[PDB]
Scaffold this active site. Structure first.
Site, PDB file in Angstrom:
ATOM      1  N   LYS B  81      -5.119   1.029   3.426  1.00 38.59           N
ATOM      2  CA  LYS B  81      -4.275   1.035   2.228  1.00 38.59           C
ATOM      3  C   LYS B  81      -4.145   2.498   1.776  1.00 38.59           C
ATOM      4  O   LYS B  81      -5.110   3.256   1.851  1.00 38.59           O
ATOM      5  CB  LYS B  81      -4.934   0.186   1.140  1.00 38.59           C
ATOM      6  CG  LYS B  81      -4.124   0.033  -0.132  1.00 38.59           C
ATOM      7  CD  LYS B  81      -4.825  -0.937  -1.057  1.00 38.59           C
ATOM      8  CE  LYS B  81      -4.029  -1.206  -2.319  1.00 38.59           C
ATOM      9  NZ  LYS B  81      -4.774  -2.153  -3.185  1.00 38.59           N
ATOM     10  N   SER B 160      -1.774  -5.701  -4.670  1.00 40.77           N
ATOM     11  CA  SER B 160      -1.385  -4.294  -4.491  1.00 40.77           C
ATOM     12  C   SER B 160      -1.535  -4.051  -3.009  1.00 40.77           C
ATOM     13  O   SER B 160      -0.759  -3.369  -2.373  1.00 40.77           O
ATOM     14  CB  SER B 160      -2.131  -3.412  -5.493  1.00 40.77           C
ATOM     15  OG  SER B 160      -3.532  -3.533  -5.297  1.00 40.77           O
ATOM     16  N   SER B 184      -5.990  -8.174  -5.773  1.00 40.94           N
ATOM     17  CA  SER B 184      -5.308  -7.342  -4.783  1.00 40.94           C
ATOM     18  C   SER B 184      -5.639  -7.478  -3.317  1.00 40.94           C
ATOM     19  O   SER B 184      -4.936  -6.908  -2.485  1.00 40.94           O
ATOM     20  CB  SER B 184      -5.415  -5.886  -5.168  1.00 40.94           C
ATOM     21  OG  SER B 184      -4.520  -5.668  -6.222  1.00 40.94           O
TER      22      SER B 184
END
EC number: 3.5.1.4
Lengths: 4, 487
Positions: B81, B160, B184
């Protein structure tokens, strides 16, 4: 306050 | 795709037998990323490619030919990420403000590289891990654009950790790393039909990650199978002096989580099925009913239970996140000498580049966070304590103790919604208790509703990852519900  | 739906252990076995090498696997994923992420359906799951990916893969192959294997992940390509530091790529959190910011490897990345993993690149995410404005759009960032759900590209990949979930679901890498503060990891995992594991806060170092909350933040693996998630967890878990939370783990040891992949892992277990409105979500009844049946047939006792204090921590969580975001982000900017040194600087930057940054939605969360009084504020101290107490000891733990349960299960969330100018059309959740308590949660594919993935969430008390993996794996092995997206 979602999905952070 | 020759490596579609192939487990890490299987890929490792192939490379070990000399029927596959890291460079071939790495170049295969890169070619697929080019064909599905940048073009074709344009998933936009990958925000930046690692220029040294091929070099790394080649080095891992040379080491293998020299007989110097690093472990189970030797030569395995993965994605990170974009809020996780990883040289020589930039770490932008999806913002244009940090486009040229390239800090050194985060602790977990150093552990993955030492384990022999190959970093393919960085994945897109909701900008600033979705802690920027009201009515935000999940999966969108100024630098990475809009990530799309591979099962239906018009729909949301949630977040996210949007790009990480999509990349794994679309086989753009073997496994990926995401981060969660509140949903998330598990929400995008469920929404995209893959496995997502959010460990107990303190199991994996948060050092080198753009933060939101030191009380709830944690990195976690995202993979197509529980076995792959367990292999990644084994590699990233560990104490780090730079992250005090990791020193709070009781009896930490070099633990191999793959040893917990027990097909009889549900035998003798006691599970509580959470009674939330999500059980009545359109098309959900048949799926959750079948899931409960599979769990019972596997040898587990399943009883209906309600979570004490469900949602009671809402106000306290809002307060603690706003206070911790300002404190943590500014500490991160200073520690890694970013081009921005304050939240005020970021707010100013977005205003100056309003055309590119504030065209879809604003930055109200950044603005409110910048006005907080600091971590010495009695209100913050009380909020931090209340949230943790309500969700953990008097929440999840109270439920587990009431019926002597090993875990709580429930549908993770609803299905993906169409991406629109308006904010996300949030259907609901059952994972917030774990996030606020700092407890482990893990979602496993449970089926689909009209072609869109739905997941089964498992939550447990602090440090129960071994038990959760056993139960999740046992469930997964008799259901094998994951179905790849059709392009």
């Amino acid at each position: 306050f979602x999905l952070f | 795709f020759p490596y579609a739906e192939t487990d890490v252990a299987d890929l490792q076995a192939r490379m070990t037998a000399g029927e596959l090498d890291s460079t071939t696997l790495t170049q295969a994923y890169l070619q697929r990323i080019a064909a599905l992420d940048r073009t074709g359906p344009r998933l936009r799951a990958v925000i930046e490619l690692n220029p040294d990916a091929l070099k790394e893969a080649a080095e891992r192959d040379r080491e293998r030919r020299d007989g110097r294997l690093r472990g189970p992940l030797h030569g395995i390509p993965l994605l990170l990420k974009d809020n996780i530091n990883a040289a020589p790529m930039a770490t932008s959190a999806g913002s244009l403000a940090l486009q040229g910011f390239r800090p050194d490897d985060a602790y977990l990345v150093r552990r993955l590289r030492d384990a022999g993993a190959v970093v393919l690149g960085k994945t897109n995410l909701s900008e600033w891990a979705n802690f920027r404005g009201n009515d935000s759009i999940s999966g969108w960032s100024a630098r990475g654009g809009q990530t799309r759900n591979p099962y239906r590209i018009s729909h949301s990949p949630c977040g996210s950790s949007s790009g990480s979930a999509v990349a794994v679901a679309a086989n753009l890498a073997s496994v990926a790393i995401g981060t969660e503060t509140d949903g998330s990891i598990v929400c995008p995992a469920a929404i995209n039909g893959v496995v997502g594991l959010k460990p107990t806060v303190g199991l994996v170092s948060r050092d080198g990650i753009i933060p939101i909350s030191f009380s709830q933040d944690t990195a976690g693996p995202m993979a197509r199978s529980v076995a792959d998630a367990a292999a990644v967890l084994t590699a990233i878990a560990g104490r780090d002096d730079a992250d005090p939370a990791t020193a709070t783990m009781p009896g930490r040891a070099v633990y191999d989580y793959t040893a917990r992949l027990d097909p009889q892992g549900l035998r003798g277990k006691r599970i509580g099925l959470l009674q939330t409105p999500l059980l009545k979500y359109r098309g959900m009844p048949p799926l959750i009913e079948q899931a409960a049946t599979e769990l019972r047939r596997a040898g587990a006792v399943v009883v209906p239970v309600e979570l004490p204090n469900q949602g009671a921590w809402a106000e306290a969580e809002r307060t603690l996140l706003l206070y911790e975001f300002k404190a943590g982000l500014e500490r991160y900017f200073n520690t890694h000498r970013a081009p921005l040194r304050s939240l005020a600087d970021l707010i100013a930057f977005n205003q100056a580049h309003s055309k590119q940054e504030l065209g879809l939605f604003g930055q109200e969360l950044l603005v409110e966070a910048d006005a907080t009084a600091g971590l010495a504020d009695p209100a913050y101290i009380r909020a931090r304590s209340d949230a943790r107490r309500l969700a953990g000891p008097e929440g999840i733990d109270a439920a587990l103790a009431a019926h002597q349960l090993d875990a709580l299960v429930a549908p993770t969330t609803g299905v993906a919604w169409p991406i629109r100018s308006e904010g996300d059309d949030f259907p609901g959740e059952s994972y917030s208790a774990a996030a606020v308590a700092g407890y482990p949660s893990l979602t496993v594919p449970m089926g689909q509703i009209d072609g869109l993935p739905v997941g089964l969430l498992f939550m447990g008390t602090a440090w129960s990852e071994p038990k959760l993996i056993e139960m999740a794996y046992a469930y997964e092995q008799r259901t094998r519900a994951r179905r790849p997206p059709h392009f």
